């Protein structure tokens, strides 16, 4: 019944189907075979050295399998005809697919490429262009080949006795068509064949996702022990909601899903808002509307105050635009596919969306609301051709008295001026001429002629870039030349650091400007449920009416000059207190228009993908005889080149459209005057543009309809506004006039905010893709498991799947099934390093690198199939660990000796016990600067060489610096060659480090002297005693598996800040701020320098020791006081090694905080500050395992008896982890510390 016994039979059966002649034993750590293909056999034929048997050996091992080398069997990969056992179905979706195909008739500039038919022996001017696009657009790179994904569902559908539709349309693709593509399993980036259609990998990636989405639901529906979902009155089947959706996209899935995701997201926002009894989850927090310290009460219901408000004309107009958006996506697919049926289950819900209720306390309404958010992720990573279009500023709106353009431009001048003043109070100033060159390392140049040169030329220019996104179409990224970005670095620096803090008060009548705007970081620091608690409590409040407008194509109306001049007017007038000092000869007012000049951002030439027209061939050669030029600009491989646009537009249209065309030089590609995403002021400026617009929003509402709609909060983030207001009348006519004056303010600014995008609702909040509904948490999961952003190279396979399980902690936290999230990792633990070995071996002997023989030079590489239960063997024993009973608990080596002593885990961890100390090891790979360096570095580099070299060869730790500059020089050649060149070196290392591997007995629970881990708690016993309250805590995030619902029930959501971040990580906060310190060195780096010397003779010998790290000099103050603090304050000198409590579900719980100790911990008082953390980090995993089993909630107490022999073993083992014997003569630390002097008298 356990996941380790039932699930391991399935992943073994996948290997029993994939490599069909493999005898697999579970109790072996990893079995080894090999296989080869003749793509490399043909190559050394061409160099002269012919081979003995060309394909005779291939005949020997196809189906007889009778040959095996060195005793190691040789087994072939399965063909495509057999991955579904030759099954066939009716599959009405598949016959919709095959009539929705079209050859040689597509528009060559288009966003998401349609169904092109592959006909063999066709032309090399169209079909090579279509093969050029699909090689860039349709790529399924990642960590797992897509072939074994299709075999995995074939094995998984049999056990659940349920057939997914993604396999039904795939099983008809195997009997009529042989092989869709040839993905090489070594690199996963090459797809060199399409047999019937160019969009065949998109056909599978939307099918290998379609199958998991209904295995996720059907497993979850039995966990809630309900038959089907329940819209507010009627029964509804969730799989029919997806099968009605999968048929509609299947003509053109990247285009259909991008226009159908808008009514699906809008439906979940406005569901339970119009019903008269409304059930909320009563919350309580601070007086500010943005306070995050929230306390939850039980569920209750209340009468709706806004019942008659939804009879208005704002919602009735907004609903028919969304019912149109359903119908336009339908009519585009009713003709391109043969189907006459569409969406019959969803259309019955949108006709009455407001008045139907939604109750979160029943699970049959929370799964359905989560499912519709997770519908849209089948066609992940929309990769799209973009075209190069210009400014076209005749459409740019000129400032007028009748328009608000000049009033917007004078508002935003007073906001950059105000951000500079309020950064002066937080000690954020401009950079100085002294540290101008030192402060240039914040990015990864400066010449008086290179700074005066322009870029509005065909000869020299700027070059665009592009990077992908999860569901959206591919957004651009701007690459600016580094000569003219440093003038933007010097003047936008006290704005990047100022809005970097997380705290803020958002009141409109407050005078300050920093709290009301906020720019987050790359990763969400903390959880998502934890730091979005201000969104939850305002959907649970009867008197908050939130307004959140949306700007469609924000840059096209940021293109206007009104925010360009008004920003630069406020830059110049605020540099007036800095008007005397000169930057390298010239003033500061001259250099701001070197980063915001005319040939910098006003009018610059940009080169993207080119314009191109589809024409005939006979008229092409009659004109191309005069203009055959190249060399100025390049042309894609399908297209035929000409010189200019003016000879390319005269022959433009053709009924046959045989051959393509492209202008190389005479194009005049693109000129843009718009705030770039690449500048240092991207997220600072456009969020201030929402502030200048949003302040004009409150004025016209207050001047046309006064007394109504008072404003209480103002949150401005990237391309979003969020007003927390309250409405003072439930009127049908008056509210219709207030909602009209909001759109008239945006339209008279220049933008066009859609009435279907604008949100004016009482009981629903969306903010930065976090949906809050009626006091609870409705989650989406757009993160996916098949595709990826770029091709991923598995360099640290110990640390890759340890990082991949973090993105599987989040998935089950949004409602994915817990055990289905175990089966995915147990599949994904065997198929990672299978093709990372160079040459073949013979077992129980040496490992052959060179062969020089015709037999073994055919069997090139090996296969390494690890056991599926390598997920559960803990770290430090050459395999990564996650616990089977709960995914959020880190399996460590002290947890392995505990989890076998518990009676409720003798059945689950019975097959785990036989594979420990059985697994193979892990593929664990590991001039200008004379100006841009601190004077700690320049004095150390301009030294006499007789003094500079003694810090390099004999002595010195020196983890950052000139050799790290060489590592920074190794980081810039890293991307192609240095990753590949050392990959030839680690493989010769890994064969020796595998042949010298002996599976060693006598596991140890301990660490070195100068560090300690969570395994320190095994010195003492632990007695589960006491009794606590069995009160079920209340929490907003419903929709969890029972392995996660019971951890949040017994242990509530946290209410304070966690204390377990030790003072070793308090100085990491000092090293987190500096980006010249953040990406390079940290606490494990800086404590090794304290390991080289403690207890010096003067503090003036103390401040200077980290200038010898040659990074900074200011933060040696924080290392002056804290070492003086640890000379005053007690400390255990050791560090803390851990890998636990970092995933975003553990940060939400009330574990590892100061209020967690006071009820769940009882420890002896003779323990230091970093020893009580090692007990508490042990104590967190014990209680989370105590709750996820069903064991009774007790108070964990570590006990020290009076057994005078056992009191001696503790005083012997606490001593050696505090002070080292031999290393005292290395550090020359004094033993007269107060903490280490107590150890004589602690336990006695």
């Amino acid at each position: 019944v356990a996941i380790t016994v039932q699930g391991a039979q399935l992943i073994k059966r996948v290997v029993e189907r994939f490599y069909p002649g493999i005898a697999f034993n579970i109790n072996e750590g990893a079995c080894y075979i090999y296989k080869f293909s003749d793509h490399i056999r043909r190559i050394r034929m061409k160099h002269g050295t012919k081979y003995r048997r060309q394909a005779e050996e291939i005949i020997r091992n196809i189906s007889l399998r009778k040959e095996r080398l060195y005793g190691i069997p040789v087994l072939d990969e399965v063909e495509w005809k057999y991955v579904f056992d030759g099954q066939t179905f009716q599959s009405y979706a598949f016959e919709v697919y095959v009539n929705s195909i079209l050859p040689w008739s597509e528009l060559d500039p288009e966003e998401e490429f349609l169904r092109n038919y592959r006909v063999s022996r066709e032309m090399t001017e169209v079909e090579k262009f279509i093969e050029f696009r699909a090689k860039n657009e349709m790529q399924i790179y990642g960590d797992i080949p897509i072939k074994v994904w299709c075999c995995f569902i074939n094995e998984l559908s049999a056990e659940l006795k349920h057939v997914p539709l993604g396999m039904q349309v795939m099983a008809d693709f195997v009997n009529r068509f042989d092989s869709p593509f040839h993905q090489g399993n070594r690199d996963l980036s090459n797809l060199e064949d399409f047999q019937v259609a160019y969009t065949t990998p998109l056909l599978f990636e939307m099918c290998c996702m379609e199958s998991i989405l209904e295995f996720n639901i059907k497993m979850r529906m039995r966990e809630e022990e309900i038959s089907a979902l329940e819209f507010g009155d009627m029964k509804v089947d969730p799989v029919g909601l997806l099968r009605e959706f999968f048929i509609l996209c299947l003509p053109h899935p990247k285009k259909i899903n991008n226009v159908l995701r808008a009514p699906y997201s809008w439906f979940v926002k406005m569901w339970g808002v119009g019903a008269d009894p409304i059930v909320v989850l009563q919350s309580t927090a601070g007086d500010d509307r943005n306070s995050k310290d929230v306390f939850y009460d039980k569920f209750r219901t209340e009468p709706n105050r806004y019942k008659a408000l939804f009879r208005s004309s704002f919602y009735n107009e907004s609903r028919r635009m969304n019912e149109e958006k359903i119908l336009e996506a339908v009519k585009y697919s009713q003709k391109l596919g043969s189907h006459d049926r569409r969406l019959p289950l969803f259309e019955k819900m949108l006709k009455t969306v407001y008045t139907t209720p939604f109750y979160p306390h029943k699970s049959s309404n929370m799964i359905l609301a989560s499912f519709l958010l997770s519908i849209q992720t089948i066609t992940g990573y929309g990769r799209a051709w973009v075209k190069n279009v210009s400014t076209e500023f005749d459409k740019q709106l000129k400032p007028n008295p009748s328009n608000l353009v000049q009033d917007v431009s004078d508002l935003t001048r007073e906001f950059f001026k105000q951000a500079y003043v309020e950064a002066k109070e937080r000690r954020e100033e401009i950079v100085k001429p002294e540290d101008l060159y030192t402060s240039m390392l914040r990015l990864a140049v400066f010449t008086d002629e290179e700074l005066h040169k322009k870029y509005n030329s065909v000869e020299l220019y700027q070059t665009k870039g592009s990077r992908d996104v999860p569901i959206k179409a591919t957004r651009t990224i701007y690459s600016i030349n580094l000569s003219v970005l440093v003038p933007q670095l010097i003047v936008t620096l006290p704005l990047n650091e100022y809005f970097s803090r997380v705290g803020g008060i958002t009141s409109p009548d407050y005078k300050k400007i920093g709290g009301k705007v906020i720019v987050g970081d790359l990763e969400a620091t903390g959880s998502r449920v934890m730091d979005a608690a201000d969104c939850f409590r305002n959907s649970a409040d009867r008197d908050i009416f939130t307004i959140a407008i949306d700007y469609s194509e924000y840059d096209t109306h940021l293109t206007r000059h009104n925010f360009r001049t008004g920003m630069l007017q406020g830059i110049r007038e605020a540099m007036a207190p800095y008007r005397d000092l000169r930057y390298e000869g010239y003033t500061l007012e001259q250099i701001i228009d070197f980063g915001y000049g005319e040939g910098r951002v006003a009018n610059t030439l940009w080169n993207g993908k080119r314009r191109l027209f589809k024409t005939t061939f006979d008229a092409y050669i009659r004109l191309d005889e005069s203009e055959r030029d190249k060399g100025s600009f390049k042309v894609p491989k399908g297209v035929l080149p000409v010189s200019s646009v003016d000879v390319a537009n005269r022959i433009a249209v053709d009924k046959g459209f045989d051959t393509l065309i492209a202008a190389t030089d005479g194009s005049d590609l693109a000129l843009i005057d718009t705030h770039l995403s690449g500048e240092n002021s991207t997220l600072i400026a456009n969020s201030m543009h929402n502030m200048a617009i949003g302040t004009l929003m409150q004025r016209e509402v207050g001047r046309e309809q006064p007394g109504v709609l008072t404003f209480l909060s103002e949150q401005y983030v990237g391309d979003d506004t969020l007003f927390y207001t309250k409405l003072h009348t439930t009127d049908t006519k008056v509210f219709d006039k207030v909602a009209a004056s909001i759109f008239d303010t945006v339209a008279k600014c220049g933008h066009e905010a859609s009435p279907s995008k604008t949100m004016m609702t009482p009981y629903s909040v969306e903010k930065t893709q976090t949906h809050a509904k009626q006091g609870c948490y409705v989650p989406q999961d757009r993160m996916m498991i098949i595709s990826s952003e770029r091709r991923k190279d598995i360099e640290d396979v110990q640390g890759y799947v340890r990082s991949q399980v973090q993105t599987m902690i989040t998935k089950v936290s949004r409602g994915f099934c817990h055990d289905l999230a175990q089966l995915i990792l147990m599949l994904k633990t065997t198929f990672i390093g299978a093709w990372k070995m160079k040459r073949t071996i013979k077992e129980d002997a040496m490992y052959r690198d060179r062969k020089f023989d015709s037999n073994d030079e055919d069997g090139f590489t090996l296969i390494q199939i690890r056991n599926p239960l390598a997920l559960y063997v803990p770290i430090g024993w050459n395999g990564y660990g996650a616990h089977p009973a709960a995914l959020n608990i880190v399996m460590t080596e002290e947890m392995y000796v505990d989890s076998i002593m518990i009676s409720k885990l003798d059945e689950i961890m019975a097959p785990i016990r036989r594979i420990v100390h059985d697994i193979p090891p892990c593929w664990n790979e590991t001039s200008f600067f004379s100006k841009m360096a601190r004077p700690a570095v320049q004095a150390a580099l301009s030294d006499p060489q007789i003094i500079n070299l003694v810090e390099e060869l004999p002595l010195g730790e020196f983890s950052p610096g000139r050799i790290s500059r060489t590592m920074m020089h190794s980081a810039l050649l890293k991307e192609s060659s240095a990753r590949t060149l050392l990959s030839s070196g680690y493989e010769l290392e890994y064969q020796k480090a595998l042949n010298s591997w002996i599976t060693q007995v006598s596991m140890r629970l301990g660490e070195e002297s100068g560090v300690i881990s969570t395994s320190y708690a095994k010195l003492f016993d632990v007695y589960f005693e006491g009794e606590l309250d069995g009160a079920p805590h209340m929490f907003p995030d419903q929709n969890l598996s029972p392995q996660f619902y019971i951890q949040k029930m017994m242990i509530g959501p946290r209410v304070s800040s966690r204390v377990r971040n030790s003072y070793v990580d308090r100085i990491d906060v000092i090293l987190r701020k500096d980006v010249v310190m953040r990406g390079f060195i940290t606490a494990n780096t800086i404590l090794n320098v304290i390991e080289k010397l403690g207890t010096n003779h003067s503090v003036g010998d103390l401040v200077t020791v980290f200038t010898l790290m040659n990074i900074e000099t200011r933060v040696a103050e924080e290392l002056a006081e804290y070492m003086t603090s640890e000379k005053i304050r007690f400390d255990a000198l050791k560090l803390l090694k851990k890998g636990i409590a970092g995933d975003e579900f553990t940060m939400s719980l009330n574990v590892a905080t100061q209020d967690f100790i006071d009820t769940y911990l009882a420890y002896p008082y003779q323990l230091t500050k970093t020893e009580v953390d090692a007990i508490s980090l042990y104590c967190t995993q014990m209680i989370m395992l105590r709750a996820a089993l069903g064991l009774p909630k007790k108070k964990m107490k570590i006990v020290v008896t009076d057994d005078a022999k056992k009191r001696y073993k503790i005083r012997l083992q606490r001593f050696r982890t505090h002070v080292p014997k031999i290393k005292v003569l290395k550090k020359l630390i004094d033993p007269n510390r107060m903490t280490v002097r107590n150890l004589e008298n602690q336990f006695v």
């Binding site: 632990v1022 007695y1023 064991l1191």
Partner: peptide, 20 residues
């Protein structure tokens, strides 16, 4: 209901007193 978990030094005492 699973009982207490012993230390390493309580586990050394059982491993010596099963051989003597």
């Amino acid at each position: 209901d699973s009982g207490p978990l012993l230390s390493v030094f309580a586990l050394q005492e059982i491993m010596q007193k099963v051989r003597q």
